[PDB]
Assembly symmetry: none
């Protein structure tokens, strides 16, 4: 049983709180767990209008990795859009990373633009139902779109099978967020030597009602992970609906990549 | 003979450092019963964007509740449930909006009175529970030059004294969203006493457990004696966060409060 | 000759740079001088859209005073709108302040709202010529108006008699700024015990082409300073056009209030 | 026989840590002569809103110049005057917009060549002037994992080595608006050499003074020998900031550059 240090990264609009059931499950097995709020997410004091790119949004992860003591390596687990924070972080700190785990997540590649899987997601799931959109101009003049996720979308598409206490928690702490899609479209592609070299484990469920089966299967086909684990049932938030299954897969990842 | 069942609009108020999130289990339980439930973040709490150093008094901290009550429709009344330091939010709200309040429910909460300074039950709480263990304190200077003490609750105090019997997912949640907070105790000491007409007139239900490891039995009993509640409900077992360890029990007590007052 | 520690505070849109001629003149006389960039001003990295009130904008001054060693007192010199930063700071740190000096500045009082002298200024000088205006919503939902000062306004009204090198410097480092007028209108009035008790010296010139003679005379009449010094000629930026005169008056203030 | 006087469009480029502001005396002097003058802040310099830790190479740092040249009208050419490290901005710009550049003027500046790595004159500068006295250094990791060294220039180095003979108002100004900066030296070392067709083809005028106390006489003379300028103007006296201590003299030299090349 290898014991590992996992860094859990929530998706846009959410915060470290979505890992509140998975963090103690992992700790029951002796793992070290760090759950971070990205900029303007969870209780991070910055507002989304001051964040200018997805790399800036990743700052809490990059600062953490910047400070990781020499010779320590982590397994970064990212849910939904956090696959982009894993790719950004892996290009900067490749040697600090034992493996990246994508949990019903975007799986960026090295061959297309950084926005490519965001484009495919939006093609697959174009209607975000009652989500509201806003814009602001970032410091270099680009128009950034933010969203405030709609509660029907939260109930039916993200937290489909979650407990009412979990769905209510989500409405009480959800924040605005942004794909920074147009800034990712202008971003240099992820490198082979950094992100391209990381070990990559893809966890998913075909009962996900927002990262739909055909988009997740397109992703796997588009850039084959080292391992794909498919959990039966649950929903998009497997760290809430299938917490022990996810904890079990991550023990297999710690065993395989330490 | 005649029995009555009533649906009510509850407004749930967290204590300093916390947010609307500690009510995430009690809010669905009450809605199961058909009640309307509002859970508000007070200033600089939960995901409220303000920082505590921009807040200058416990009144200023109460703004989300006051705004909410200002907006209530003509003839709508609510029952305000406040946990721990939120009894001061109930007293501040009651002196501004007495006719919009059907009852105040104090849930392992400070029970201010009208006879003493607004800071009086805070002094007694601290005499009772002077050591906040690994809690860290800070200070800032407010808009009129008062030194305000803020605190970052320590994780052992969180585990052992506030969330004693809560599950690990609930304790882990608390650590992920807890904010700085302040008692504003010295500015409460300079504050006009709560009025009789406002706060003194409100119905007051006191819910508590003698297993609470931070608002301790001798303090809670002193408050009940100091300012007799219209009704007291002691819940056996649980811990300070009865809305997490005794959610159904608190929801059923709150149904009785609605039947009686709403 | 008393030697004093002066804290110089620029007006909105400007930064510590407007004191670049007055700071060495004061230092030639043995004074300690601190020139601060307020939030989102000079080279301060914050952008104006993240600042939510004039009290927040005053943070560099309040942090400085927060840290002033016990028993030290300063003379805060504020130009144009910086009279509001002196009043905000004096209510929080009255005992740290030997005197407030208003240099062609707003002179807030205790009897009216904090926005009252801003209203009178705008009544006196309603047209800011080629200045541009923008708005953003602050974190509590108020609409904040920002301005980017127009260069004709800069040349003719603010830097009227200044050297071309000084006017060119102003265009190279000017930033956006805000009066936060509507938040000042909702702000508790300045207190008697803090701001009301400070010694107050008013320096002005009747050749000021933006804080016009009748507004400055209305201010003096509205809340009589302990001392009024009137410099002949120059323009609105007396610390550039009459630097030695200003340095001389401030030596008299150090002598009188230490 | 026939004499020629020409008005030109000069684009003035500050060195790392500085901004458009060090040109505040030379810009009016040139406009006195009827020239059009643009002085740009490069990324994270002057009042540019970007922070240096978001910039990943000296090319990325040069974006304001590149954007400006992209926007120049068809047939407009400019003379780029760069001080100290800005000779690298001139070389980066010239390999993208050679036909918009009438001449590059290196003003107590790095004079990159096409034969060696882009980092070569930066290595020679540091061999020549290894001790930056009270300058503080920091590091951050860029977008592909390179460690970038940034510096906050020390005030004694500012006073004695960069602004030696400048007035106190100019030295005080520098302290009030100086930013962090970076040579990006290791990323320049990995960079493709400047091309012959672009940068190699540009006219190059080298202005310098042997009284410069940071770009020292032996370094400046080595650069002139290393990559012969089309014209050299040595200004007697002054200091590193000749656009402040010899503004009129630099403006008159720049009139000669316009007469010759614009």
């Amino acid at each position: 049983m290898v014991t590992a240090h996992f860094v859990l990264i929530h998706t846009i609009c959410h915060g470290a709180w979505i890992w509140h059931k998975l963090k103690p499950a992992l700790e029951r097995a002796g793992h070290k767990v760090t759950a971070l709020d990205m900029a303007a997410s969870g209780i991070d004091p910055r507002q989304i209008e001051q964040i200018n790119s997805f790399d800036e949004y990743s700052e809490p992860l990059l600062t953490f990795l910047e400070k990781l003591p020499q010779g320590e390596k982590v397994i970064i687990v990212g849910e939904a859009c956090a696959g982009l924070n894993i790719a950004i972080a892996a290009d900067r700190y490749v040697d600090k990373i034992a493996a990246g785990v994508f949990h019903n997540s975007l799986l960026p590649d090295t061959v297309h633009s950084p926005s490519y899987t965001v484009e495919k997601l939006l093609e697959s799931f174009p209607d975000w139902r009652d989500t509201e959109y806003f814009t602001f101009t970032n410091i270099t003049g680009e128009t950034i779109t933010t969203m405030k996720l709609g509660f029907v979308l939260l109930r039916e598409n993200l937290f489909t099978k979650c407990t009412d206490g979990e769905y209510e928690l989500a409405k009480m702490v959800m924040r605005k967020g942004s794909l920074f899609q147009n800034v990712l479209a202008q971003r240099p592609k992820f490198t082979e030597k950094g992100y391209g070299s990381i070990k990559k484990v893809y966890i998913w469920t075909d009962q996900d009602k927002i990262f739909l089966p055909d988009f997740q299967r397109w992703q796997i086909a588009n850039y084959k992970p080292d391992k794909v684990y498919q959990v039966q049932g649950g929903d998009h938030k497997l760290q809430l609906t299938k917490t022990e299954e996810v904890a079990h897969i991550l023990q297999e990842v710690a065993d395989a990549y330490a």
